[PDB]
Symmetry: C3
Subunit: 114 residues, 3 copies
């Protein structure tokens, strides 16, 4: 799995530990080993949500399987929570796009996961 | 809806009010209220289009529905027009990927849209 | 086609000629004129792979067709090889997401490719 956060919250406001926390939290949430979890946080963005420049986030979660209606509800509660507590972003100013990737469509280590 | 623009045009060349203009125009074109509209502009990129580093843009529009042949043609004219007028980018150096998202795959406010 | 590379490798460790090399090798690999190829390299990112901040890359390849099981294995061999030779990133710390885009869903030059 891979989790990307783009946000207008400044770099300095991203707490020590946040990548490692995202990694352990997603490894737990997805049931995948942490060695397979990639995390990417992109602060200081020029972005707006609802027309306002108050803190906000645009995020993506890509996984081969482990993506569905109930699972994504449980991801968004987990992830919004972490962004609220760590980054001080309101859950109603967060978007998370979920992608169920086909193994053949994910390359790694000179090949794909097919 | 969410609209992202990545461009090699420098930050200083993005005119004031550019995020609010995208938000208003995308509310109108999509039928969604400006409240649900997210916009993200990423200048100063290291990027090439056709092997050339003249001004260019790679862009994404995600929406739950409101994506289709005619609508996308209409979005592209809207949006190339704004990048031409506001950022001095030629329309033939713009790519815009459209994504019709399933409601169960968009997270927001601790839940999903399904 | 469009190829995006997000990496924590610093800007100064990206060798001169990289975008042109990527454009040339993707033209060859996808069978498409280099005029249609767009390439985007984002260095200096705050990311982790498998909970390590050693060099890593998260990438995407979008193409209208020329996407599939075998083709994507071949892409991954070519693309990992380049990120290992040029950026000194281990192929097992690279992900590349492949997207077969519908022509209706790729905007360009005020319209779409449909």
């Amino acid at each position: 799995p891979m989790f990307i956060v783009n946000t207008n919250v400044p770099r300095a406001s991203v707490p020590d530990g946040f990548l490692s926390e995202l990694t352990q939290q997603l490894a737990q949430a997805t049931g995948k080993p942490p060695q397979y979890i990639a995390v990417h946080v992109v602060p200081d963005q020029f972005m707006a949500f609802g027309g306002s420049s108050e803190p906000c986030a645009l995020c993506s979660l890509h996984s081969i399987g482990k993506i569905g209606g109930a699972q994504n509800r449980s991801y968004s509660k987990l992830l919004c929570g972490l962004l609220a507590e760590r980054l001080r972003i309101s859950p109603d100013r967060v978007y998370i796009n979920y992608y169920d990737m086909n193994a053949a469509n994910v390359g790694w280590n000179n090949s794909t996961f097919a």
